Amino acid sequence: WTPPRSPFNLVQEILFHDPWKLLIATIFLNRTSGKMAIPVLWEFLEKYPSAEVARAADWRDVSELLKPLGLYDLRAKTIIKFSDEYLTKQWRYPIELHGIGKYGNDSYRIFCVNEWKQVHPENHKLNKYHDWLWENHEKLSLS
DNA sequence: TCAGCGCATGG
DNA sequence: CCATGGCTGA
Ligand code: NI
């Protein structure tokens, strides 16, 4: 299952192949416009390209990078905690990991695995992509 | 259930 | 000047 390319241009569309990165992106999007978030996301991933590196990071460094986005202190600790649990803890779904609620977990289930028909998002932009799928899904291949 | 985190941007 | 761009812990 490989997600199609929508006009909405969600960042999840290019991060489906890396569940960790996709979920990091969701956290960056927590009450934060992707207009400011996405650029900082690339600066972040360039510094911490994996969960093995992210868990071993010092949060004061990350919050420094997250400063212009707001929610910098809590996210930094969340990102580190989430990264550790993403590796250490045995999950079957990311919601069980700290910092990931329904939105992040619905993103994982639409993009990282094929459960998108079993997914009913409450998020705005996730509903739009989900709708754009249903109409065009048969014109592609999926079912 | 809900305060709280938090800075930018548009309204 | 307020409102909008998710989640935890309590
Ligand atoms: Ni959770």
**Which method resolved this structure?**
X-ray
The resolution in angstroms reads: 2.4
Burial class (CB in 10 A: 0-12, 13-18, 19+), A111: buried
Q: Which nucleotide across the nucleic acid strands is nearest to A33, CA versus C1'? A: C5
CA angle, A59 as apex, A31 and A17 as ends, to 5°? 60
Q: How many helices (H) and strands (E) does chain A have?
A: 7, 0
Q: Which nucleotide across the nucleic acid strands is nearest to A35, CA versus C1'? A: C5
Q: Residues 47-76, chain A: which have Cβ under 7 A from strand C?
A: 69-71
Taking the C-alpha atoms of residue A48 and residue A56, their distance in angstroms, rounded to an integer, is 10
Both tokens of A49, joined, read 């390209």
- In angstroms, the Cα distances linking A68 to A27, A63, A77, A99 are 15, 9, 16, 20
| Domains, chain A | 1-143 (1.10.340.30)
Q: Which residue is nearest to nucleotide B6 (CA to C1')?
A: A70
Contact A101, A31 (CB under 8 A): no
Q: With the CA atoms of A53, A87, A16 and A29 taken in that order, what torsion angle do they form, in degrees rounded to the nearest 10? A: -70
Could you say which nucleotides of strand B lie within 7 A of any protein CB atom? 5-9
How many whole angstroms from A102 Cα to the centroid of ligand 1? 8
